[PDB]
Amino acid sequence: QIITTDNTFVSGNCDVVIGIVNNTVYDPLQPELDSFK
Amino acid sequence: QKLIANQFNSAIGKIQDSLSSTPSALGKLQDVVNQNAQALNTLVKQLSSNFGAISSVLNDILSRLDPPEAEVQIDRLITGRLQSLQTYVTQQLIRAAEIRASANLAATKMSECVLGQSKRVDFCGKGYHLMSFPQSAPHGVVFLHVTYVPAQEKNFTTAPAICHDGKAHFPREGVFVSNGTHWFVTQRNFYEPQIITTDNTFVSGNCDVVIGIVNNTVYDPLQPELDSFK
Amino acid sequence: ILPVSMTKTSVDCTMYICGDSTECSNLLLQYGSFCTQLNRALTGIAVEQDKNTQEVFAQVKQIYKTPPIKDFGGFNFSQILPDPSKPSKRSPIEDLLFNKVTLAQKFNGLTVLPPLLTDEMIAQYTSALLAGTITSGWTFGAGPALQIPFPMQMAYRFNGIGVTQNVLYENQKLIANQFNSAIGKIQDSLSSTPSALGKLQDVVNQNAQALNTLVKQLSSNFGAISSVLNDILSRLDPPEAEVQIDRLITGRLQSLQTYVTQQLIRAAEIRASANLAATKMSECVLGQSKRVDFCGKGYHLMSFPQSAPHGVVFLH
Amino acid sequence: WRVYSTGSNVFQTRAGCLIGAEHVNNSYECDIPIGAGICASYQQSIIAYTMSLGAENSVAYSNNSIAIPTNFTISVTTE
Ligand SMILES: *[C@@H]1O[C@H](CO)[C@@H](O[C@@H]2O[C@H](CO)[C@@H](O)[C@H](O)[C@H]2NC(C)=O)[C@H](O)[C@H]1NC(C)=O
Ligand SMILES: *[C@@H]1O[C@H](CO)[C@@H](O[C@@H]2O[C@H](CO)[C@@H](O)[C@H](O)[C@H]2NC(C)=O)[C@H](O)[C@H]1NC(C)=O
Ligand SMILES: *[C@@H]1O[C@H](CO)[C@@H](O[C@@H]2O[C@H](CO)[C@@H](O)[C@H](O)[C@H]2NC(C)=O)[C@H](O)[C@H]1NC(C)=O
Ligand SMILES: *[C@@H]1O[C@H](CO)[C@@H](O[C@@H]2O[C@H](CO)[C@@H](O)[C@H](O)[C@H]2NC(C)=O)[C@H](O)[C@H]1NC(C)=O
Ligand SMILES: *[C@@H]1O[C@H](CO)[C@@H](O[C@@H]2O[C@H](CO)[C@@H](O)[C@H](O)[C@H]2NC(C)=O)[C@H](O)[C@H]1NC(C)=O
Ligand SMILES: *[C@@H]1O[C@H](CO)[C@@H](O[C@@H]2O[C@H](CO)[C@@H](O)[C@H](O)[C@H]2NC(C)=O)[C@H](O)[C@H]1NC(C)=O
Ligand SMILES: *[C@@H]1O[C@H](CO)[C@@H](O)[C@H](O)[C@H]1NC(C)=O
Ligand SMILES: *[C@@H]1O[C@H](CO)[C@@H](O)[C@H](O)[C@H]1NC(C)=O
Ligand SMILES: *[C@@H]1O[C@H](CO)[C@@H](O)[C@H](O)[C@H]1NC(C)=O
């Protein structure tokens, strides 16, 4: 399934963790709020 | 991760010194060997006893008396030796039952601790249980329980619920704690404070139901995002 | 209710069989090392009983004390905490248990050894375990004791059986009242029927019966002239007195051997029961168990151990 | 054999008499089992005392006080 901000929890800075990979996390808020600018 | 690896490495290396520190560490196997060895030695020693007969040696029994009269002495010796052998066999059977119980316990410990996590307390060494490692032994099995025990604890003032506009708030996963000025939500087994509203709180009832409740601001990060559209 | 340890005992082979008569005693040594094996087995049984008691009850490296003021006044724990008014430190339920168990005497060759852990220290251990499970919750068995309010611990325990924290806090008064009523009712249920504690009276009475059977066998002559060696020594000539005393020796030795074997079987059964009780303690009071029906009917929340005259009782 | 029969150092217990072992009213751990909650250990001489159960740890408790760890330690326990 797609990586969304409602599926994963975020805590900490990127530097401390070893082995991370850069990627983009989808946000279900952005397209629902974009239709009601 | 580096600290956990360092602790695990420094912990395993201490097992060798702990085991080799004293000869009493391996008592549970030395006792098992020694009881059987001494029982066998006692059974062997029981052979050279008169048991009320004229002599304990078969050859002397045959040589000293004629068969019609030596038959009684042979019967006495045979009955005594049979009693000794029977009592040794009974002792060995009881000890075998005890060892079978211990082996079943060891098999259960292997199948639970080694091959997966176990939520049974104290069944996996003191403290919370992580992966475990077995080791072979001469007449048994020796385990290594990698446990997780908390330390360096500090106390905070808590409360079961947080008031917010006449609406009780409860922790989704954790416990409300406060350092005296502000309130946070943290996992129950490790101090890690966070903001409250975003995901880790669920709403039920009003404030008048619960007994001891405290007021605090419940701030959803959703609203600042909405104000970005104003 | 689970038995944990039978009464320790030990017999002197020469004193029991030979009556300390000289020549009859030196005649026994011809039979071999039968005397040493029985003494060693009885010593092993006694040390196993001691180990069972220590393993079941000494589950904590520290002793805890309940707070002087009961700030968890929702739930009422006066029926299981150590009552200070009585001269004994046993709790009211413990005191009811002690008075409900009744019948082990000295004899010619039989003795009884006191346990290492006296009853008062066993009660102290149980009080420490109860105070740990009341104040610090389930985490005092894993590491350092962590204080936590009792309603919050109950909220966690409810959260561990598939029901969220809403149920407890919104119904704290009802839960406290029901818990107090049940804790009051268990005492009446236990005191109502004397046969409730039968699992300990059984082992005590049956050990006493075995000991009496062992003692009663003296009177049996085993086909000899008389049951007293004095009559044989002072009446019959040595040539046949030797045969008669040897027959009596064989009979008494066989009786003692069968008693020793029966005690070994009983000790094995009691060791199994004590291991089960220790596992039950370590999985019930020192934490939460997901094992259904292993900790009583219904989903398990807590467990309060209490001492017994020769075992441990659990209040799931 | 009877040289260890001096009555000046005889200590009476609940599980028989003791000869040559000093008796102290303090509290220590279980070193050598004796019986009826008495254990003997080594100080110069041998001391026999009454058994003790760890060290008292009165945990502070309140209806609004909780404690959570801020650090961990990993331990390996043999069996
Ligand atoms: C993931 O993205 C971040 C940010 O774009 C990268 O961090 C920077 O990487 C460049 C090299 O590509 C460095 O010159 C910068 O100094 C980095 N920024 C900081 C603050 O250190 C990061 O390298 C990317 N991850 C990977 C694996 O390339
Ligand atoms: C309790 O925790 C709060 C967390 O916010 C502390 O407040 C912070 O204190 C630091 C100290 O330098 C400031 O830099 C932050 O700006 C403060 N944050 C806020 C939101 O005010 C507070 O000091 C702590 N109090 C105690 C007694 O530990
Ligand atoms: C924890 O217990 C203390 C001790 O009783 C409570 O403090 C009292 O609370 C009552 C009810 O609000 C007041 O009338 C008293 O004046 C308080 N006394 C003191 C000395 O503070 C406290 O309220 C309890 N807290 C909870 C959450 O139950
Ligand atoms: C938490 O907030 C509630 C309301 O948001 C407070 O209840 C108020 O208490 C005062 C007492 O002086 C009353 O005059 C108000 O009418 C109450 N408001 C409501 C909506 O009932 C409550 O006292 C606050 N508690 C704390 C500890 O600050
Ligand atoms: C907790 O339970 C104890 C029971 O031991 C209660 O004490 C009894 O209270 C009743 C109330 O009338 C008295 O008649 C009894 O004499 C008390 N003692 C006993 C041994 O029953 C106690 O009231 C309960 N509540 C609290 C807060 O302790
Ligand atoms: C948590 O505890 C560990 C040790 O159990 C701490 O690591 C120690 O840190 C000090 C100073 O940073 C070093 O001198 C020690 O050598 C470290 N111990 C080990 C075993 O490596 C760690 O700092 C603690 N965490 C916090 C946040 O204080
Ligand atoms: C994995 O191991 C390789 C070694 O071949 C190393 O080059 C790489 O950086 C490692 N990556 C991570 C995430 O550990
Ligand atoms: C935390 O516990 C200690 C005792 O271990 C106590 O002295 C202290 O007051 C407690 N903290 C607070 C905030 O009360
Ligand atoms: C130790 O205490 C006992 C009473 O508990 C007392 O009789 C004895 O004199 C004390 N010993 C010393 C050396 O004071």
Q: Which two tokens stand for residue B55?
A: 């002599």
C248-252: Cβ within 8 A, 24+ apart: C248/C221, C248/C222, C248/C224, C249/C17, C249/C18, C249/C24, C249/C27, C249/C28, C249/C31, C250/C222, C251/C217, C251/C220, C251/C222, C251/C223, C251/C224, C252/C16, C252/C17, C252/C217, C252/C218, C252/C222
Query: SS3 of B3, please?
Result: helix
Tokens 């007969």 belong to: B53
- The answer to whether A25 and A6 have CB atoms below 8 angstroms apart is no
Question: Which amino acid would we find at residue D51?
Answer: M
Tokens 């080799």 belong to: B20
Q: Ligand 6 in contact with D57 (CB < 6 A)?
A: no
User: Residue D71: nearest ligand to its CA?
Assistant: 6
Chains A and D share 3 or more Cβ pairs within 8 Å: no
Query: How far is the C-alpha of C20 from the C-alpha of C287, rounded, in Å?
Result: 56
Query: SS3 of B76, please?
Result: helix
Contact B229 A11 (CB under 8 A): no
Phi, psi at C193, each rounded to 5°: -115, 120
C-alpha dist (Å) from residue B121 to B117, C141, C160, D39 = 12, 8, 15, 31
Question: Which amino acid would we find at residue B117?
Answer: Q
Residue (of C292, C286, C97) closest to C200 by Cα position = C97
Residue nearest to atom 1 of ligand 6 (CA): D71
- Distance (angstroms) between ligand 2 centre and the Cα of B181 equals 8
Buried b (16+ CB within 10 A) or exposed e, C237-254: eeeebbebbbbbbbbbbe
Query: How far is the C-alpha of D40 from the C-alpha of C131, rounded, in Å?
Result: 29
Name the maximum alpha-carbon separation found in chain C. 92
- The answer to whether C304 and C314 have CB atoms below 8 angstroms apart is yes
- Half-sphere exposure (Cβ direction) of C223: Cα atoms closer than 13 Å: 7
C-alpha of C246 from chain center? 39
User: Residue B217: nearest ligand to its CA?
Assistant: 4
Query: How far is the C-alpha of B178 from the C-alpha of B156, rounded, in Å?
Result: 6
Query: How far is the C-alpha of C221 from the C-alpha of C248, rounded, in Å?
Result: 7
Q: What resolution in Å is listed for this PDB structure?
A: 3.8
Alpha carbon of C72: minimum distance to chain B alpha carbons (Å): 12
Packing angle of the helix pair C92-99, C172-192 (nearest 10 deg): 20
Residue (of B181, B87, B196, B189) closest to C146 by Cα position = B189
Q: What is the DSSP letter of C8?
A: P
H or E element that contains B133: strand B128-137
Q: What are the residues whose beta carbons fall under 8 Å from the beta carbon of C195, sequence distance 6 or more? A: none
Nearest to B94 among C34, C148, C268 (CB): C268
Cβ pairs C/D, distance under 8 A: 80
Q: Ligand 6 in contact with D65 (CB < 6 A)?
A: no
Q: Which two tokens stand for residue D64?
A: 């609004």
Alpha carbon of C77: minimum distance to chain B alpha carbons (Å): 20
Query: How far is the C-alpha of B169 from the C-alpha of B195, rounded, in Å?
Result: 13
Left (φ > 0), alpha (ψ -120 to 50) or beta: where does C49 sit? Answer: alpha
- Distance (angstroms) between ligand 2 centre and the Cα of D69 equals 20
Elucidation technique: cryo-EM
- The answer to whether C135 and D59 have CB atoms below 8 angstroms apart is yes
Q: What is the DSSP string of C153-192?
A: HHHHHHHTTT--THHHHHTHHHHHHHHHHHHHHHHHHHHH
Mutational test site, ligand 8, from D56, D64, D65, max ligand atoms within 8 Å of CB: D65
Name every chain B residue with its beta carbon within 8 A of the beta carbon of C146.
Answer: 150, 153
Query: SS3 of C241, please?
Result: helix
Contact A33 B199 (CB under 8 A): no
- Distance (angstroms) between ligand 5 centre and the Cα of B196 equals 41
Query: How far is the C-alpha of B37 from the C-alpha of B88, rounded, in Å?
Result: 12
Length of chain D: 79
- Distance (angstroms) between ligand 2 centre and the Cα of B182 equals 8
Considering only alpha carbons, which residue of chain D is nearest residue C139?
Answer: D68
- Name residue B158's beta-bridge partners: B177
Query: How far is the C-alpha of B198 from the C-alpha of B172, rounded, in Å?
Result: 11
Query: How far is the C-alpha of C301 from the C-alpha of C155, rounded, in Å?
Result: 10
Q: Which two tokens stand for residue B10?
A: 């420094």
Query: SS3 of C246, please?
Result: helix
Query: How far is the C-alpha of C66 from the C-alpha of C78, rounded, in Å?
Result: 11
Kindly report the number of other CB atoms within 10 A of residue C293's CB atom.
8
Q: What is the DSSP letter of C133?
A: I
Query: How far is the C-alpha of C209 from the C-alpha of C293, rounded, in Å?
Result: 34
Kindly report the number of other CB atoms within 10 A of residue C18's CB atom.
23
Q: Ligand 6 in contact with B6 (CB < 6 A)?
A: yes
Phi, psi at C203, each rounded to 5°: -65, -40
H helices present in chain B, as ranges: 2-21, 27-45, 58-64, 67-109, 222-227
- The answer to whether C1 and C200 have CB atoms below 8 angstroms apart is yes
Q: Which two tokens stand for residue C79?
A: 């029926």
- The answer to whether B212 and D64 have CB atoms below 8 angstroms apart is yes
Length of chain B: 230
Please give all residues whose beta carbon lies within 6 A of any atom in ligand 5, as ranges.
C 73, 76, 78-79
Mutational test site, ligand 4, from B183, B215, B217, B218, max ligand atoms within 8 Å of CB: B215
- Distance (angstroms) between ligand 8 centre and the Cα of B104 equals 46
Query: How far is the C-alpha of B166 from the C-alpha of B163, rounded, in Å?
Result: 6
Query: SS3 of C36, please?
Result: helix
Query: SS3 of C39, please?
Result: helix
Nearest to B143 among D71, D75, D79 (CB): D79
- Choose from C118, C127, C152, C154 for mutation: most chain D CBs within 10 A: C118
- The answer to whether C91 and C83 have CB atoms below 8 angstroms apart is yes
- Name residue A26's beta-bridge partners: A4
Tokens 């030395």 belong to: B30
